[PDB]
Amino acid sequence: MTIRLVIVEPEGAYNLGFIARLVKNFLIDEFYVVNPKADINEAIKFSAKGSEVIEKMMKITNNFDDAIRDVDLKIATSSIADSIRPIDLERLIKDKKVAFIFGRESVGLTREEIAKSDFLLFIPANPEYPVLNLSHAVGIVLYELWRN
Amino acid sequence: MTIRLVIVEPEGAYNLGFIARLVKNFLIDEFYVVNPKADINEAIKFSAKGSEVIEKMMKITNNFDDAIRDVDLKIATSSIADIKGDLLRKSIRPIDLERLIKDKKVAFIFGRESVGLTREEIAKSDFLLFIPANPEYPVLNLSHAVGIVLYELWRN
Numbered sequence A: 001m002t003i004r005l006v007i008v009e010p011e012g013a014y015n016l017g018f019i020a021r022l023v024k025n026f027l028i029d030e031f032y033v034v035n036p037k038a039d040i041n042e043a044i045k046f047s048a049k050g051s052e053v054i055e056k057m058m059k060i061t062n063n064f065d066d067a068i069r070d071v072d073l074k075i076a077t078s079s080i081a082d083s084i085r086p087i088d089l090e091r092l093i094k095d096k097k098v099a100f101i102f103g104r105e106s107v108g109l110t111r112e113e114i115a116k117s118d119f120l121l122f123i124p125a126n127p128e129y130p131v132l133n134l135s136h137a138v139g140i141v142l143y144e145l146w147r148n
Numbered sequence B: 001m002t003i004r005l006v007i008v009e010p011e012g013a014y015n016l017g018f019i020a021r022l023v024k025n026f027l028i029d030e031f032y033v034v035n036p037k038a039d040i041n042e043a044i045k046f047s048a049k050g051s052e053v054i055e056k057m058m059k060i061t062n063n064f065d066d067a068i069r070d071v072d073l074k075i076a077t078s079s080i081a082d083i084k085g086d087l088l089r090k091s092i093r094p095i096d097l098e099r100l101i102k103d104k105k106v107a108f109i110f111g112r113e114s115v116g117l118t119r120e121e122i123a124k125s126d127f128l129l130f131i132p133a134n135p136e137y138p139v140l141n142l143s144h145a146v147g148i149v150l151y152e153l154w155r156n
């Protein structure tokens, strides 16, 4: 069992640094970022000891296909506004290499990205306001994985 | 259950704004901030739809004691992964929350990005919650700790 975190075209340097921190906090095995729009040098200021993740672990790809090679399962994420829940994860990911895919702050994921995913995970939240900030959604999912 | 979120002396405007967003994402009942250092005007930018949360819902107090009045239970938080000594008697994990907070008004108390909660703030609390994470680096960014706890509460 190996977990790859894939972040697609992140825009906010704070979000990218916060995600890098979380990769260390929750011992995620692999970390890929597709065509980042955020300034990575600025992201490092938000990363605390996740700076090491940015510098040694993070793989930067220009295209989505190159971020999702050589895994057994791909799980995309979206809020209910735009399908499985975190409680489903343990059963699906047991003894698998799995990629968890998170989308852009402004626009989420494209049709390609969703087509290439096996499941779509939503974090239950206020139906009136179910959209979490990107890095907070990542943290919740990584916490759930750690619990397992 | 009724939940009061208490944030002690937040320093980062991004953290304060992100917390305000989470308050709306997870329908927290009461939101107190003790002596904020962050620029509240700047924080509103990170609050997305949490902006109404800051402007109207959020209560500011000068002192810790005023933020934890009139609740049944006070649950402080800390990143200390292997507590020793007397504080062990207060230590809890998230799995313990459901049983502890049933039919109660509970304050969940988070500390400063720089230095966390003081020893006396923890002494004034009933329990000390650790969120499990890498024992070599368990220290979450403040707003991410808040999001994980609020998600755990929502589940329940």
Ligand SMILES: Nc1ncnc2c1ncn2[C@@H]1O[C@H](CSCC[C@H](N)C(=O)O)[C@@H](O)[C@H]1O
Binding pocket: A077, A078, A079, A080, A082, A101, A102, A103, A104, A105, A106, A107, A108, A109, A121, A122, A123, A124, A125, A130, A131, A132, A133, A134, A137
């Ligand atoms: N409740 C939730 N459950 C699962 N993922 C979520 C979520 N809230 C946010 N996300 C994650 O955070 C990313 C940025 S939020 C993107 C929102 C944007 N308005 C849109 O059109 O989609 C999403 O792509 C998803 O990966």
Ligand SMILES: Nc1ncnc2c1ncn2[C@@H]1O[C@H](CSCC[C@H](N)C(=O)O)[C@@H](O)[C@H]1O
Binding pocket: B077, B078, B079, B080, B081, B082, B083, B084, B085, B087, B111, B115, B116, B117, B118, B119, B122
């Ligand atoms: N494993 C441990 N590491 C550090 N302090 C611990 C400990 N076990 C017990 N202690 C006690 O726990 C107290 C924490 S008080 C300081 C708390 C810190 N600002 C925070 O918010 O996390 C210390 O005064 C210390 O005496």
Ligand SMILES: Nc1ncnc2c1ncn2[C@@H]1O[C@H](CSCC[C@H](N)C(=O)O)[C@@H](O)[C@H]1O
Binding pocket: B077, B078, B079, B080, B109, B110, B111, B112, B113, B114, B115, B116, B117, B129, B130, B131, B132, B133, B138, B139, B140, B141, B142, B145
């Ligand atoms: N693993 C964890 N469990 C519980 N609370 C955590 C945590 N990681 C961070 N926090 C919360 O986030 C706040 C900021 S982190 C504070 C770090 C500080 N160097 C210290 O030693 O205290 C903490 O005060 C606590 O409320």
